[PDB]
From a paper:
GSTs are a multifunctional superfamily of enzymes, distributed in all major kingdoms of living organisms. Residues of the N-terminal domain residues assist the formation of a GSH binding site (G-site), whereas hydrophobic residues of the C-terminal domain form the hydrophobic substrate binding site (H-site).
The structures of sh101 and sh155 enzyme variants were resolved at 1.87 and 2.00 Å resolution and compared to the wild-type AmGSTF enzyme structure that has been recently reported. Sh101 and sh155 were crystallized with two and three molecules in the asymmetric unit, respectively. The sequence between the β2 and β3 strands where the α2 helix is located exhibits significant distortion due to high flexibility. Amino acid sequence alignments of the sh101 with the parent enzyme AmGSTF showed 94.98% identity. For instance, the region Tyr118-Arg127 has three substitutions in sh101 sequence (Gln119Glu, Phe122Ile, Met125Leu), as a result of the replacement of the C-terminal part of the α4 helix by the sequence derived from the crop-type GSTFs (TdGSTF and HvGSTF). Furthermore, the sh101 enzyme exhibited lower S0.5 and Km values towards CDNB, leading to significant improvement (7–8 times) in catalytic efficiency compared to the parent enzyme AmGSTF. In particular, the Tm values of sh101 and sh155 enzyme variants were significantly increased by 8.3 and 5.2 °C compared to the parent enzyme AmGSTF. Inspection of the crystal structures of sh101 and sh155 shows that Lys93 can form a new salt bridge with Asp62 of the opposite subunit.
Numbering used by the authors:
A (entry chain B): 2 to 36, 50 to 216
B (entry chain A): 2 to 34, 51 to 216
The structure:
């Protein structure tokens, strides 16, 4: 019984769910656009369970399909799970609020509506993001991935908005942070990530 | 062996961690390093940051059949805990916290005038959030089901400071939300932490 994801595949929050589903090898069906295509929250159905909110859906998927091969939350190991949780929360409350206004001002608003970019909002965000990337640079100088030497929910959570940031004029900023840039290219080589990236087209 | 929390007891995010420690009956120290400062935490050689990550580590480590606040052995119950934890983080708290800043934090710590127009932008926005809470808590005593969980405890710190602003009586128009808030305030762990967010 394939689970159902409701929403536009190019939404950052729908792509978070489908990336998790691809990383665990689950079969699923994506059901149509809306009723913003870049931000809309997914609904989800697995049998009689109906869920909302992409982070809760994603964690349900990573638990239900966990194997010894594929354990992206590490819940049996409290130290590892704690590090997954830490960098999941850094994404949600620190990295994404610094990066997503750049994506909206430079990519989404011009692309969807021909709206002008507000360079003052973008510039505030860039200075905030630069301080954040200094922290990621030190972390990813110690480990291949954010939670340790294994890929996890923490890394996957960074994919959808960062992918769109890479289509703005500021993508070159990551080159000032070579270990962050190395980590980004590691993620972009994963076959599940390439699969979802091909779905994220306007 | 006791664990250490780093940060001010007053902080909304330190209180999330200390409430979790009190509900599991854990032995801990608090070491004072505005109302939103992110805590650090030490257990042996494990050093953590971010109150929700620390809180979950605590609720897993000290878990018992009496105190299972994450519900991780039942994927469907854990899903509902996660849903309402996210609603708190990205919907309820962004509605509620600017009322705390512009009625309580900024007029009594930063010396700013109480911007009584972003207060009404937040109030009208909080009103439509509470409608959804009122429907949810009308067929469950708690957010994740008929059991208290991390989802409910997550709402305590900011709601405790909202309850100290002029607009505390807004909950009275949502009787199932009010009755839910009353069940949380009656817990001994909650009463004990509430006493720390004041001196």
């Amino acid at each position: 019984a394939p689970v159902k994801v409701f929403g536009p595949a190019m939404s950052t929050n729908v792509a978070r769910v489908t990336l998790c589903l691809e990383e665990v090898g689950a079969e699923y069906e994506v059901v149509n656009i809306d009723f913003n295509p870049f931000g809309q929250i997914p609904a989800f159905q697995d049998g009689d369970l109906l869920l909302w909110e992409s982070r809760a859906i994603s964690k349900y998927v990573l638990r239900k399909y966990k194997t010894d091969e594929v354990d992206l939350l590490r819940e049996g190991n409290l130290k590892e799970a704690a590090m997954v949780d830490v960098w999941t929360e850094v994404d949600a409350h620190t990295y994404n609020p610094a990066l997503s206004p750049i994506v909206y001002e430079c990519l989404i608003n011009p692309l969807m509506r021909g709206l002008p970019t507000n360079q003052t909002v973008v510039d505030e965000s860039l200075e905030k993001l630069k301080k954040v990337l200094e922290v990621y640079e030190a972390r990813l100088s110690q480990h291949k991935y954010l939670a340790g030497d294994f890929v996890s929910f923490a890394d996957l959570n960074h994919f959808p908005y960062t992918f769109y940031f890479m289509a703005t004029p500021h993508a070159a900023l990551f080159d000032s942070y070579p270990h962050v840039k190395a980590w980004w290219d590691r993620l972009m080589a994963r076959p599940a990530v390439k699969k979802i990236a091909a779905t994220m087209v306007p």
